[PDB]
Amino acid sequence: EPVAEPDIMATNRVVHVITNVLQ
Amino acid sequence: EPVAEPDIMATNRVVHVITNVLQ
Amino acid sequence: EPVAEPDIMATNRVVHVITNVLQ
Amino acid sequence: EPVAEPDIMATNRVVHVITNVLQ
């Protein structure tokens, strides 16, 4: 993982896609 | 339901069920 | 059948809600 | 370094009612 001076960090995964309700 | 020998079956309407979209 | 089939229900449109997305 | 983990799985709930096969 990246190394640097201490700071605020929080790993997160975001996934989105355009879609419509099936019914 | 009626019981008899196999033969042509009249088409019956089908109603969908509301459910969360997979996408 | 022992239980009557569900009555026909018309699909209802759903309006999307605007939200902040990082991506 | 360790291999990056894949995208986090998004659990979903599916509800359906058994009915006559369309085919």
UniProtKB/Swiss-Prot annotation, chains A, B, C, D:
Modifications after synthesis and translation: Gamma-carboxylation is controversial. Gamma-carboxyglutamated; gamma-carboxyglutamate residues are formed by vitamin K dependent carboxylation; these residues may be required for binding to calcium. According to a more recent report, does not contain vitamin K-dependent gamma-carboxyglutamate residues.
Superkingdom to which the source organism belongs: Eukaryota
Location within or outside the cell: Secreted; Secreted, Extracellular space, Extracellular matrix
Effect annotated for changing V21D: Found in lattice corneal dystrophy; unclassified form
Tissue-wise expression: Highly expressed in the corneal epithelium. Expressed in heart, placenta, lung, liver, skeletal muscle, kidney and pancreas.
Induction line: By TGF-beta.
Subunit structure: Binds to type I, II, and IV collagens.
Record's function text: Plays a role in cell adhesion. May play a role in cell-collagen interactions.
Disease entry from the Swiss-Prot or TrEMBL record: Corneal dystrophy, epithelial basement membrane: A bilateral anterior corneal dystrophy characterized by grayish epithelial fingerprint lines, geographic map-like lines, and dots (or microcysts) on slit-lamp examination. Pathologic studies show abnormal, redundant basement membrane and intraepithelial lacunae filled with cellular debris.
Protein's recorded name: Transforming growth factor-beta-induced protein ig-h3
Species of provenance: Homo sapiens
Full-sequence range covered: 611 to 633 of 683
